[PDB]
Amino acid sequence: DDFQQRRAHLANLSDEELQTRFWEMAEKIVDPLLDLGKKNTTPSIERSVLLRMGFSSLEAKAIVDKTMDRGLMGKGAGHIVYKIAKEKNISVREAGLALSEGKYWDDAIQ
Amino acid sequence: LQLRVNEKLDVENILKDLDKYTPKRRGWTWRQPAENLQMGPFIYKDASTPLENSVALPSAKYFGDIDPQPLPVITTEIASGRFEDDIRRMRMAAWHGADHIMVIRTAGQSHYDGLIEGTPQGIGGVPITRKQVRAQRKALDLIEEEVGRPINYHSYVSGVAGPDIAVMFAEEGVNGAHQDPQYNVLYRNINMIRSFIDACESKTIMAWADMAQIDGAHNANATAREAWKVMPELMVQHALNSIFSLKVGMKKSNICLSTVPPTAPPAPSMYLDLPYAVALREMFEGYRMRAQMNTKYMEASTREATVTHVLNLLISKLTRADIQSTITPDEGRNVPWHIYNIEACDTAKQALIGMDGLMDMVQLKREGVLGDTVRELKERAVLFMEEIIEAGGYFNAVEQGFFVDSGYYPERNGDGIARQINGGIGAGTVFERDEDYMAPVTAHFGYNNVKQYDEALVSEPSKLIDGCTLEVPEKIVYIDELDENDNVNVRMEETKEFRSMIKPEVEWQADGTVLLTMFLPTSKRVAEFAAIEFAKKMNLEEVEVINREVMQEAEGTRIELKGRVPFSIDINSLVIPPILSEDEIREDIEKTPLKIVAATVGEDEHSVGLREVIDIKHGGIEKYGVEVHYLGTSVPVEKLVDAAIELKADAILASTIISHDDIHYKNMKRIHELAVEKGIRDKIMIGCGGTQVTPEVAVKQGVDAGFGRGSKGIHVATFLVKKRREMR
Numbered sequence: 001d002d003f004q005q006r007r008a009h010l011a012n013l014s015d016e017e018l019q020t021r022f023w024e025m026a027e028k029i030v031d032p033l034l035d036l037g038k039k040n041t042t043p044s045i046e047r048s049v050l051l052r053m054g055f056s057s058l059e060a061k062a063i064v065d066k067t068m069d070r071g072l073m074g075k076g077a078g079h080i081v082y083k084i085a086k087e088k089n090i091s092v093r094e095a096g097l098a099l100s101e102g103k104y105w106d107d108a109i110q
Numbered sequence: 111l112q113l114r115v116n117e118k119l120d121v122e123n124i125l126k127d128l129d130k131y132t133p134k135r136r137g138w139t140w141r142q143p144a145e146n147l148q149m150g151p152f153i154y155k156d157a158s159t160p161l162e163n164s165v166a167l168p169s170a171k172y173f174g175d176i177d178p179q180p181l182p183v184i185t186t187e188i189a190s191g192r193f194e195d196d197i198r199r200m201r202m203a204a205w206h207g208a209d210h211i212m213v214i215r216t217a218g219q220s221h222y223d224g225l226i227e228g229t230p231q232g233i234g235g236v237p238i239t240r241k242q243v244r245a246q247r248k249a250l251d252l253i254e255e256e257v258g259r260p261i262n263y264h265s266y267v268s269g270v271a272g273p274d275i276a277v278m279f280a281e282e283g284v285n286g287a288h289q290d291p292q293y294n295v296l297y298r299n300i301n302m303i304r305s306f307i308d309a310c311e312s313k314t315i316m317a318w319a320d321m322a323q324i325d326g327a328h329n330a331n332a333t334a335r336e337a338w339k340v341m342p343e344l345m346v347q348h349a350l351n352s353i354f355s356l357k358v359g360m361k362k363s364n365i366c367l368s369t370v371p372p373t374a375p376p377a378p379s380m381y382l383d384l385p386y387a388v389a390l391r392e393m394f395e396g397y398r399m400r401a402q403m404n405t406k407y408m409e410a411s412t413r414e415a416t417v418t419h420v421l422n423l424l425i426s427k428l429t430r431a432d433i434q435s436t437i438t439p440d441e442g443r444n445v446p447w448h449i450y451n452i453e454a455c456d457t458a459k460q461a462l463i464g465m466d467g468l469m470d471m472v473q474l475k476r477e478g479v480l481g482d483t484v485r486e487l488k489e490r491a492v493l494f495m496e497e498i499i500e501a502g503g504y505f506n507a508v509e510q511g512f513f514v515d516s517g518y519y520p521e522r523n524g525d526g527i528a529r530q531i532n533g534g535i536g537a538g539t540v541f542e543r544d545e546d547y548m549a550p551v552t553a554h555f556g557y558n559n560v561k562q563y564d565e566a567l568v569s570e571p572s573k574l575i576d577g578c579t580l581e582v583p584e585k586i587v588y589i590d591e592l593d594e595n596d597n598v599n600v601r602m603e604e605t606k607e608f609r610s611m612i613k614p615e616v617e618w619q620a621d622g623t624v625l626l627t628m629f630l631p632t633s634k635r636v637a638e639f640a641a642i643e644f645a646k647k648m649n650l651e652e653v654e655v656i657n658r659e660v661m662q663e664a665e666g667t668r669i670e671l672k673g674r675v676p677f678s679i680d681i682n683s684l685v686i687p688p689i690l691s692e693d694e695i696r697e698d699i700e701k702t703p704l705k706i707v708a709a710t711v712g713e714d715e716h717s718v719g720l721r722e723v724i725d726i727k728h729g730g731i732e733k734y735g736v737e738v739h740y741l742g743t744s745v746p747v748e749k750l751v752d753a754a755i756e757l758k759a760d761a762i763l764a765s766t767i768i769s770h771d772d773i774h775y776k777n778m779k780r781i782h783e784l785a786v787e788k789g790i791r792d793k794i795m796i797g798c799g800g801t802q803v804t805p806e807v808a809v810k811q812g813v814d815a816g817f818g819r820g821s822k823g824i825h826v827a828t829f830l831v832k833k834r835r836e837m838r
């Protein structure tokens with residue numbers, strides 16, 4: 001302390017002010033992270049989309065594995081299956097399913 | 111369907127029809143305060159609603175077996191590797207007051223890049239899968255109906271499949287979970303970008319589920335060289351996961367700080383931990399406090415752990431705990447046994463109840479040394495944030511090794527953990543979303559362009575697909591087993607035999623383990639080994655010395671050992687036989703007065719023995735209201751009787767200590783005869799006792815009862831009321 005000279009600019013805050021600071025600086029620190037969250041996705045986030053759509057864990061993995069092979073992640077593995085079913089006039093499941101076995105990716109790229 | 115208190119939980123029946131199980135309830139539940147509650151003789155300032163079926167503290171027997179329940183929700187940790195055994199321990203624990211059952215995952219499930227399926231054998235924990243979860247939660251549904259108070263199912267949304275597990279938990283009604291992206295990075299070395307992006311998704315899902323979230327701060331205690339210096343760091347982590355969660359859209363009342371008092375004796379622990387405890391709760395007004403028990407400075411003595419855990423409950427009571435987790439007092443000695451989960455649960459229920467309304471009579475000296483340290487710690491926390499901000503925010507802080515440092519911040523020993531913002535499990539598995547990125551599901555976090563399909567569905571992205579599994583449970587894909595060898599039904603069969611034989615267990619059905627406590631008159635190493643020999647010669651397999659305490663370097667050592675019992679026993683093969691209370695004895699003599707003459711008889715001066723069953727001191731008949739007329743010692747047999755007659759006594763008690771030449775039986779016989787001669791023998795009770803007396807040999811002499819070594823008053827009194835009835 002050292003500590004003593006570093007807290008100099010803190011000495012005159014009130015307990016409410018010191019708390020308020022703590023928290024506003026907390027928010028300032030995690031805000032960037034929150035953003036990363038809005039603007040990006042990951043294999044787990046995508047697989048979790050598929051899970052919620054009616055697909056299995058094994059299936060979800062295969063669909064995402066092939067979505068990454070096509071740099072397509074940027075669109076959304078759930079998205080792909082959707083456009084894919086609304087295009088061929090098929091069941092959300094049959095579409096997704098088909099994609100798990102490397103079908104309709106030709107179509108997906110356009 | 112059903113459950114009877116005297117009928118074991120049918121696990122086989124639970125493993126059945128799992129593909130069609132749903133939860134009964136969704137969300138976390140708190141306990142209902144029961145204000146000014148009356149139970150037995152007492153009124154309770156800080157109790158919640160009582161259970162309909164429970165096991166009271168042993169000593170409750172002296173208060174009508176009341177089993178009052180404290181305000182804070184109580185946790186216990188049950189995860190043996192085999193969930194199917196664990197469910198039974200759950201029932202056990204729930205009856206001892208637990209309403210929060212937390213299941214640690216299989217060793218490093220954090221590293222599994224997706225869900226697992228089925229029921230492989232866990233390692234240092236249960237492998238969390240949809241099957242095993244549906245099983246346990248189905249079971250708990252049953253158990254909570256039995257005890258009569260909703261139970262909270264809990265586990266870990268961590269690692270690289272956070273989002274995955276969050277969905278599974280949400281669907282299958284898991285009521286609480288750990289989630290803290292900070293954990294992932296510091297201790298599991300998972301890419302910091304990947305995990306903070308995942309957390310948003312997970313936390314959003316958990317938000318949907320109205321799940322209680324516990325954080326990871328406590329792991330900082332564990333990693334720290336000296337936990338009494340890690341508090342400023344503690345307050346930052348807590349702060350970071352809380353604001354983050356809050357912002358994602360969680361309720362402040364669902365965000366729980368996982369907070370363990372940092373020190374334990376011989377350290378001045380209340381003195382050290384209390385001001386931090388107070389600071390923490392001042393800074394996070396509004397948030398939930400999940401109090402957990404110390405495991406760092408814990409050893410192999412279960413006693414030690416229990417005492418320190420009581421000081422942990424004191425810390426919660428001087429401040430606040432919305433949730434109070436517990437640690438088995440054997441956590442430092444082995445993997446938790448059934449009996450020590452229940453020890454924990456008793457201790458916590460016990461101390462807290464004992465501390466009922468204690469803050470009406472005690473309070474914090476907030477203005478003094480306490481207040482000063484509280485401010486000091488808050489300031490070290492604030493500084494800590496400033497320096498994170500000042501170096502480019504979270505990521506650079508972690509890289510520059512701000513975390514896990516053994517110094518007392520702002521003091522920096524430069525030995526923290528440093529993570530690459532670009533290294534770790536899952537580095538470069540972060541993808542940018544494009545203008546047209548979409549996800550047609552409920553509870554999704556980031557940019558979701560649905561407007562490209564319907565401006566009106568922006569608030570209902572599930573409507574794109576007529577509901578997601580969160581709205582259409584049926585759509586969920588159930589998988590039962592993947593591995594035909596490593597599963598529960600293969601495990602349930604290697605032991606179906608024991609479902610009419612029996613043997614002792616500690617964690618898993620019939621594992622044959624038991625505990626051995628002894629003391630040996632030699633030093634510690636010699637005694638450690640002698641201990642093992644004795645254990646061996648008792649027919650024990652797999653003998654381990656698990657605890658060693660030095661009574662004195664030379665006078666002796668306590669040893670504790672576990673081992674295996676190689677046999678079973680047939681319930682059928684045991685012969686098992688099939689009692690007046692002190693209140694029954696008292697009542698009978700209260701109603702019918704009862705008068706005695708007593709004496710040490712003959713040429714005997716030994717008086718202590720008779721008086722030992724009369725004086726109220728050690729439970730003598732005086733206690734029950736018997737009218738004792740005491741003649742003294744060296745009283746003549748003829749005299750004893752004459753008095754019994756003069757005083758119209760109901761019984762004669764005679765003490766017969768000297769036993770030379772059967773003089774003791776000889777006088778017993780002279781008394782019977784003397785009564786007969788005087789025609790009162792049929793109207794009187796005659797009891798005689800002494801060191802060399804054998805009750806049978808004394809009845810053969812003609813007297814009604816005989817008492818020797820170890821006679822207490824309850825015995826003699828039980829004999830006076832019983833025999834008296836028998837004569838009317």
Ligand code: B12
Pocket residue numbers: 713714715716717718719720722723763764765766767768769770797798799800801802817818819820821822826
């Ligand atoms: C201390 C003692 C004495 C004390 C007695 C002090 C006193 N006021 O009581 C003094 C007084 C120091 C003493 C004297 C002698 N005693 Co001495 N005494 C002992 C000793 C060590 C105490 C026993 C005792 O009190 N036990 C504690 C009480 C709690 O137990 P208790 O009497 O057995 O009573 C229990 C049960 O018997 C039962 N019970 C007993 N009576 C009754 C009655 C009823 C109705 C019921 C329901 C139950 C019941 O309830 C009690 C529950 O725990 C014993 C040795 C021994 N360990 O037995 C001898 C001992 C009994 N006495 C002995 C002897 C030899 C003597 C002396 C002759 C020695 C001498 N002077 O040379 C003298 C004789 C004096 C005399 N005139 O009788 C011998 C007797 C040998 C024999 N079989 O006859 C003994 C056995 C010692 C020995 N082995 O040599 N001694």
Ligand SMILES: Cc1ncc(COP(=O)(O)O)c(/C=N/CCC[C@H](N)C(=O)O)c1O
Pocket residue numbers: 187214215216217218219220221266267268269288289290293298324325326328329402435
């Ligand atoms: C926030 C978080 N996520 C995941 C994991 C563990 O998951 P894996 O081991 O990485 O697969 C942990 C570990 N906590 C240790 C014991 C729990 C303690 N006894 C308790 O009071 O909660 C954690 O803290």
Ligand SMILES: CC1O[C@@H](n2cnc3c(N)ncnc32)[C@H](O)[C@H]1O
Pocket residue numbers: 226227228230592593594596
């Ligand atoms: C080592 C392990 O691999 C998994 N696993 C995934 N697919 C299979 C399969 N077709 N056969 C056996 N185990 C499988 C388990 O869930 C596990 O226990």
